[PDB]
Amino acid sequence: DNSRYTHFLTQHYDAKPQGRDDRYCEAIMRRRGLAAPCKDINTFIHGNKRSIKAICENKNGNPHRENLRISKSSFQVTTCKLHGGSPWPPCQYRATAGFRNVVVACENGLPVHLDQSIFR
Fold first, then answer.
1. Helix (H) or strand (E) segment spanning residue 95
2. Which residue is catalytic, options 7, 12, 64, 83?
3. Which of 61, 65, 106, 107 has minimal Cβ neighbours within 10 Å of its Cβ?
4. Which residue ranges run through the membrane?
């Protein structure tokens, strides 16, 4: 019943990146299965999982807009944005490293969606 949380981790969590440059994005977007077709934009959250799960409770989150949650703490993040016109591989990505709060949707106390709009 929490497979969407696993999918969230696969799409949006990378605990200990080093670089976070373009080549980081190119490699991780392939590894996580987001490169056929190339996903237009995708953000990874870094650090520990517990802080991310805590966004689903008062501990580290507030309600946001119609049905989302927004974190109290800031996270290291990396956003990978597709460069080029083709949605098909090879997928070239531009990396933008950041440090800010994140917006998620939660179900059963677990994140299951990242709102990408804040990273555009």
1. strand 92-100
2. 12
3. 65
4. none
